[PDB]
Structures are given as structure tokens and as C-alpha cells.
């Protein structure tokens, strides 16, 4: 299995998945995801319920955000989970906008768990914001999930800031 240091050195979003669904040997399942602007409290996206790809359709105002709060709920299968860690790398074209390295902590088996994380946005020039709005899906992320420094899940996303 891939270690955090291997993906922390990646300069580009991966072409393909770095692991298989069967690599999720803890049966971690994401059951709710919510993000909110911590400036206004406005909920920006909420969802509750293969499935390793999400396409986000946001508005230009999204790229004026500074601080966004994420709440994640997940269930865990019958094994204990220690040092649950997500490295999420946001790219525009072929370069890193920002790396996020979040601690999801310890989980007991068959448990339902909630975590709160804060995304502080990178500083974006006006030219980069316009490029991102006018190049939908050129902004892309890899979310790499590690338990005890072993890669168990890889989720992908892309982003448009094009919406009405």
C-alpha cells in the first residue's frame, strides 16, 4: 500500500485511482457531507446516503470564500481504525492550488462517527479566479484516505464555478 509521503509529493491530479474499492478493508462508508461558509453560516452543499467520483457545480462567489467548514459522517466496519487521515490535493490544470491534511482520529468497530474540518482557501489572484470560472472541470481534487499510514480509499472530484 501507498504511504502519505508518496502522494504528498504528487505535482498533478492522478490519471486514475491509486487503489481498488476492495482496498477499503475497514469498510469506511461516508454517510453525510456538509460544507458551509464560516463567514455567513450559509450551507453551500449537503448530501446524505462505482461511487468514487463527485462533480461539483458551484458559482463564481465560491472562489471569493476564505474559510469553509466541512462536517463528514462515516460508518466503520467490524475492525478498529487508528490514525484515520485524509490528504486532499486540489489542482488547477497541472499544479497544486492547496494540500489539506486532516486527522479523522480513532474509531471503534461498527461505529458511526462525525468529524469537523476547516478549509482555509489559498490566496487566489483575480487572473487565477477568472481562469477557474472560465475553465470548468480544469479544477480537480484527489482525496487519499489512510489508516495507520496505509491507503484504503481514493475519491476524485472536479469543479465548475460556472453556475448561475
Amino acid at each position: 500500500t501507498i504511504r502519505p509521503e508518496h502522494v504528498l509529493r504528487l505535482s498533478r491530479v492522478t490519471e486514475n485511482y491509486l487503489c481498488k474499492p476492495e482496498d477499503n478493508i475497514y469498510s469506511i462508508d461516508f454517510t453525510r457531507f456538509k460544507i458551509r461558509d464560516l463567514e455567513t453560516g450559509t450551507v453551500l452543499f449537503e448530501i446524505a446516503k462505482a461511487g468514487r467520483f463527485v462533480r461539483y457545480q458551484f458559482t463564481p462567489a465560491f472562489l471569493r470564500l476564505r474559510t469553509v467548514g466541512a462536517t463528514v459522517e462515516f460508518t466503520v466496519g467490524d475492525k478498529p481504525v487508528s490514525n484515520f487521515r485524509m490528504i486532499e490535493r486540489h489542482y488547477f490544470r497541472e499544479h497544486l492550488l492547496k494540500n489539506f491534511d486532516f486527522d479523522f482520529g480513532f474509531c471503534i468497530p461498527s461505529s458511526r462517527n462525525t468529524c469537523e474540518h476547516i478549509y482555509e482557501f489559498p490566496q487566489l489572484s483575480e487572473d487565477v479566479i477568472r481562469l477557474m470560472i472560465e475553465n470548468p472541470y480544469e479544477t480537480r481534487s484527489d482525496s487519499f484516505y489512510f489508516v495507520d499510514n496505509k491507503l484504503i480509499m481514493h475519491n476524485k472530484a472536479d469543479y465548475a464555478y460556472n453556475g448561475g
Binding site: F30, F33, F45, I47, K49, G51, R52, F53, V54, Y56, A70, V72, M86, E88, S141, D142, S143, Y145, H154, N155, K156, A157
Partner: peptide, 5 residues
């Protein structure tokens, strides 16, 4: 990525 179901 946590938005994936």
C-alpha cells in the same frame, strides 16, 4: 472527496 456516495 467526502461528497462521494
Amino acid at each position: 472527496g467526502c461528497g462521494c456516495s
